[PDB]
Amino acid sequence: FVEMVDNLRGKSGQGYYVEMTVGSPPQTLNILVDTGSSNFAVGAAPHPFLHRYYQRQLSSTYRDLRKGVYVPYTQGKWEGELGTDLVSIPHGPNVTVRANIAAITESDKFFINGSNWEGILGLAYAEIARPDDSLEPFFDSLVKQTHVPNLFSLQLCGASVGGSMIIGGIDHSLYTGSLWYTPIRREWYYEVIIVRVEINGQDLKMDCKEYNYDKSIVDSGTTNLRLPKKVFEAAVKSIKAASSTEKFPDGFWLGEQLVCWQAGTTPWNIFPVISLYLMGEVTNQSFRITILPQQYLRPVEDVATSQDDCYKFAISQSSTGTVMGAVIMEGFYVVFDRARKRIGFAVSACHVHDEFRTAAVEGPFVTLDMEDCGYNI
Numbered sequence: 561f562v563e564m565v566d567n568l569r570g571k572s573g574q575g576y577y578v579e580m581t582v583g584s585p586p587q588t589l590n591i592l593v594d595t596g597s598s599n600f601a602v603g604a605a606p607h608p609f610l611h612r613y614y615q616r617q618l619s620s621t622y623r624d625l626r627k628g629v630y631v632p633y634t635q636g637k638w639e640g641e642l643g644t645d646l647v648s649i650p651h652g653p654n655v656t657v658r659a660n661i662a663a664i665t666e667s668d669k670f671f672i673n674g675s676n677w678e679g680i681l682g683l684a685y686a687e688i689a690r691p692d693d694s695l696e697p698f699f700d701s702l703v704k705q706t707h708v709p710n711l712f713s714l715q716l717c718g719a720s721v722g723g724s725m726i727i728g729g730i731d732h733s734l735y736t737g738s739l740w741y742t743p744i745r746r747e748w749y750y751e752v753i754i755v756r757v758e759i760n761g762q763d764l765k766m767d768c769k770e771y772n773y774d775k776s777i778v779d780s781g782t783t784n785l786r787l788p789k790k791v792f793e794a795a796v797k798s799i800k801a802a803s804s805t806e807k808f809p810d811g812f813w814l815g816e817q818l819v820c821w822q823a824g825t826t827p828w829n830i831f832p833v834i835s836l837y838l839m840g841e842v843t844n845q846s847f848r849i850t851i852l853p854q855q856y857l858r859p860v861e862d863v864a865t866s867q868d869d870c871y872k873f874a875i876s877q878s879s880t881g882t883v884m885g886a887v888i889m890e891g892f893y894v895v896f897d898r899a900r901k902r903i904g905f906a907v908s909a910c911h912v913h914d915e916f917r918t919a920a921v922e923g924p925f926v927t928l929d930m931e932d933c934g935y936n937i
């Protein structure tokens with residue numbers, strides 16, 4: 561695992577990527593690590609924002625599957641062709657496998673100027689793959705073709721950023737304290753259940769199904785903590801109340817506007833900690849992960865504003881359920897234990913903290929109310 565430590569890079573708010581190769585001879589590409597999708601998709605034609613791309617004509621191991629694929633997102637979209645080829649992760653396991661690849665030949669508002677990644681590694685399950693669930697995801701192919709155990713872990717680190725993706729096991733050097741597990745409720749997204757939410761120690765006091773309307777997921781491919789409208793508004797109310805000695809424009813709370821302080825003077829202490837209690841592996845037991853403002857206030861690097869430290873509010877409203885994105889995962893060691901259908905959280909070597917507060921994973925907590933917090937079945 562020591563060879564795999566620090567195999568992730570990123571620019572703050574642009575995404576964490578890992579080096580991969582595709583084809584024979586190998587073509588090196590930087591690839592976004594995305595637990596929120598299930599396609600391995602790489603740019604395969606020139607694009608103004610692509611510094612390099614997959615050239616299939618140069619790979620004699622490429623096989624054309626003779627099927628197109630169209631993938632729309634909320635913002636942006638791309639079209640491509642399906643095929644398979646040899647894929648490896650130079651700073652991952654010492655293996656090369658054959659995997660499905662979506663070769664992206666045309667796109668719109670997809671490739672981000674300056675992000676440094678040229679494709680996406682979708683690490684979730686076949687159920688949400690495009691065009692349909694018959695297209696085996698990369699990790700499934702990896703496990704089937706090699707002896708690698710069916711789990712990976714992600715240590716995403718804040719700040720230029722970095723981290724580790726450990727495939728096939730748990731690296732104890734990357735966390736301290738206990739590792740706490742929450743069940744994967746359904747294998748499509750990495751879906752989990754939130755049973756309680758506190759802001760500065762105060763329970764939001766909602767029916768816990770509200771926290772998971774209509775699903776909750778762990779998604780390295782999303783930046784923000786995204787919350788259902790009802791939960792979002794209650795969270796903003798509590799955070800505003802705690803930070804009321806300073807008032808910010810409406811646009812800040814919507815994520816449309818930056819707030820800045822003279823470098824080094826960010827008033828971290830007027831912003832509350834957020835605790836998300838996740839369903840435990842034992843009935844009505846839970847554990848909490850605690851999120852500091854150093855996490856949910858996302859710094860925006862810009863040389864022009866660099867006399868200050870400036871931030872975006874990295875909590876936003878969702879109409880498709882809760883998303884625990886990178887700002888939630890950062891500072892934690894997160895184990896995607898597919899083999900045992902559970903996700904583990906532990907305090908990471910690069911967890912956030914200041915002289916008064918620290919990110920934490922704590923348990924067990926017991927709750928008398930026996931309501932099932934799942935929204936659907």
Ligand SMILES: C[C@@]1(c2cccc(NC(=O)c3ccc(Br)cn3)c2)CO[C@@](C)(C(F)(F)F)C(N)=N1
Pocket residue numbers: 573574575576594595596597633670680779780781782783886887
């Ligand atoms: C495939 C998809 C996607 C597509 C294009 C870009 C991105 N991600 C980022 O650029 C980025 C930036 C900063 C940080 Br930190 C993490 N990631 C994600 C579709 O969109 C979601 C966000 C979803 F959930 F809608 F499916 C997802 N996970 N993967």
